[PDB]
């Protein structure tokens, strides 16, 4: 069954309590400039599945190492940059670390030290019951083409003429126009003095 | 009391810590039943009765 | 659990939204910062005696 | 007033289908007693 | 009006009464129907 409520056909619902799929041509969505979209009343089973992309992530890690009979030294660097499967750059995580660890022994005394810096930039596709992406995405009729909503030069996808006005918004608008970023800087380390006597 | 909320919606499903029970007990609205197991529904709408 | 690195306690604070119903998000926890390529050995002490 | 046709927040108030566990006034119960009534008790202790 | 969307509509007893008596206060807090421009109340619990 497709777009509707009470089992009856509708042109504007966020749900799929309409009639059993006909193949007939029915209307849907809002009306813009005395025009409306018209499509065959069929199911689009892949519509939510097709909304996603492939997340991509690239990582680079290096390390430098060496030692003597009285000393050792390690220095490393890591880099991570994730842009996940939800469209646009709202699923983002950049990780950067740097570390330097050493120990030196001189007699009974041993002094070692570790110092690490960590960076991250998170961006998140916010969840919730309001004007969020996934809540807006699940509230789609089974017959409506989701990936057909991304083109904003199509007036019918602009926020004022989106096909349904029921507590949800065009998911590509929410991802392209909302913000929830986090940037963090972090330093940690230790100093240890060992002395045998 | 022997009960305390850990997280939960107002008038909705809520997860508790109750005295003689495991951590994280859930309570949620179920429909009414007659003493003999059958589901009570509303005479006019057909829908279950809380 | 208490994350202990060499061997100093590590901050494991979590940054996530305080209203999960309307603006849910999660930004990481303090252990996610360690670089796994640097780990030689991890040992988990399970008991508390 | 009544429940608008196209939304669904107050169906159970209008149809009298809430119950005790619907907490339909716990927010107000807390405000009146642990907000106001406590502040009042403190006022009457602090001023003569 | 901010936390939720508009959920309340006029109820039938209030509308029928303000209409019977010719009361102009029927315009305060109540809005004519966006379809025919009259005042309509909904019978309590009768949305569905």
């Amino acid at each position: 069954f497709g777009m509707g409520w009470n089992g009856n056909h509708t042109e504007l619902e966020n749900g799929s309590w309409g009639p059993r799929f006909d193949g007939s041509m029915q209307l849907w969505g809002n009306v813009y400039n005395n025009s409306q979209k018209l499509k065959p009343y069929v199911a689009m089973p892949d519509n939510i599945k097709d909304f996603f992309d492939a997340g991509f992530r690239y990582s680079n890690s290096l390390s430098f190492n060496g030692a003597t009979d009285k000393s050792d030294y390690y220095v490393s660097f890591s880099q991570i940059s994730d842009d996940g499967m939800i469209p646009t750059d709202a699923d983002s995580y950049d990780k950067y670390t740097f570390s330097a660890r050493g120990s030196h022994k001189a007699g009974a005394l041993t002094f070692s030290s570790s110092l690490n810096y960590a960076y991250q930039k998170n961006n998140f596709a916010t969840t919730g019951q309001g004007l969020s992406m996934l809540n807006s995405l699940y509230q789609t009729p089974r017959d409506i083409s989701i990936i057909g909503l991304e083109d904003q030069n199509d007036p019918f996808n602009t926020p004022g003429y989106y096909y349904t006005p029921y507590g949800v918004m065009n998911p590509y608008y929410i991802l392209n126009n909302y913000l929830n970023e986090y940037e963090s800087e972090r330093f940690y380390g230790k100093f240890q003095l060992d002395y045998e006597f | 009391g022997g009960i305390t909320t850990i997280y939960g919606l107002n008038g909705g499903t809520s997860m508790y810590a109750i005295t003689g029970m495991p951590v994280g007990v859930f309570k949620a609205q179920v429909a009414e039943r007659d003493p003999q197991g059958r589901i009570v529904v509303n005479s006019s709408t057909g829908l279950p009765v809380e | 659990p208490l994350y202990v690195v060499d061997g100093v306690p590590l901050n494991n604070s979590t940054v996530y939204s305080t209203d999960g119903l309307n603006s849910g998000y999660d930004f990481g926890n303090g252990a996610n910062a360690i670089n796994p390529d640097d780990v030689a050995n991890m040992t988990i002490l399970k008991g508390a005696a | 007033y009544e429940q608008k046709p196209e939304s669904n927040q107050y169906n159970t108030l209008c149809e009298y289908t809430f119950t005790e566990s619907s907490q339909q006034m716990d927010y107000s119960y807390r405000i009146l007693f642990a907000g106001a009534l406590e502040d009042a008790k403190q006022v009457l202790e602090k001023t003569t | 009006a901010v936390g939720l969307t508009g959920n309340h509509c006029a109820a039938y007893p209030l509308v029928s009464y303000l209409s019977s008596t010719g009361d102009p206060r029927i315009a305060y807090g109540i809005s004519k129907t966006d379809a025919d421009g009259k005042y309509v109340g909904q019978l309590p619990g009768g949305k569905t």
Partner: peptide, 10 residues
Amino acid sequence: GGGGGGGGGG
């Protein structure tokens, strides 16, 4: 317990 949620349009 605390938080509350809306319903939907339909």
